[PDB]
Amino acid sequence: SCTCRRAWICRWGERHSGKCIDQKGSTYRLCCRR
Structure with missing residues (x-):
């Protein structure tokens, strides 16, 4: 949720x-970089 x-x-x-x-996230799950 950060990229x-x-x-x-x-x-x-x-x-x-x-x-x-x-x-628009059609499917590809987002990702956050801590």
Whole structure:
């Protein structure tokens, strides 16, 4: 929930917390970078 991205993976050890309102999360789960 800190990096609106669309991919099966994320930056690195990111934590999911929901998507944002810019690209519309059609399915790709967002990811947060602590």
